[PDB]
Design a protein around this ligand. Structure first.
Ligand SMILES: CC(=O)OC[C@H](O)CO
Ligand SMILES: [Cl-]
Length: 175
């Protein structure tokens, strides 16, 4: 009687999948079951970032340009990859958290499903290769939320008009 979620089926990460995610992405939206997670995420006004996989070490080097309180905060870190599980992981508050990487029909968008920990904390984020998207580009994201029974009204979106990091990224590139 519990309908299952075809867009959330894990898919093993290969060297080809690591090439597919190499490059620049924009953070578009998330929604979590935990309300404090939604409110925490609400302070992030925009974020774009670059991934550079290291296939030997099963890591990905992340350079992130986040706008928070109307300024740019730049940070680098390493994510771990669990190839056979289809997950990538990041240390959050000193604990490793895992997410399934789900590359969408259109390889221009992908989602991270945070469905590896306690069920009361599950959530979904979606990313694209441009800062703006259409409702249609987000079809798989909204279907998955419906299937996870997270209402659309809990989604937190970034607002690209608020970005402050394009000026920095531009200088990082001139150098
Ligand atoms: C795995 C995880 O918690 O996050 C991946 C990263 O935050 C998105 O760029
Ligand atoms: Cl689904």
């Amino acid at each position: 009687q519990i309908p299952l979620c075809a867009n959330l089926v894990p898919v093993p990460i290969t060297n080809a999948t690591l090439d597919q995610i190499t490059g620049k992405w924009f953070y578009i939206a998330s929604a979590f079951r935990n309300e404090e997670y939604n409110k925490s995420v609400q302070e992030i006004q925009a974020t774009f970032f670059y991934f550079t996989p290291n296939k030997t070490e099963d890591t990905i080097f992340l350079r992130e340009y986040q706008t928070r309180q109307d300024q740019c905060i730049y940070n680098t870190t390493y994510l771990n990859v669990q190839r056979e599980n289809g997950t990538i992981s990041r240390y959050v508050g000193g604990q490793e958290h895992f997410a399934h990487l789900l590359i969408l029909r259109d390889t221009k968008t992908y989602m991270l499903a945070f469905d590896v920990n306690d069920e009361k904390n599950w959530g979904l984020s979606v990313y694209a290769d441009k800062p703006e998207t259409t409702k249609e580009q987000l079809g798989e994201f909204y279907e998955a939320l419906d299937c996870l029974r997270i209402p659309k009204s809990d989604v937190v979106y970034t607002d690209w008009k608020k970005d402050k990091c394009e000026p920095l990224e531009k200088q990082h590139e001139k150098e």
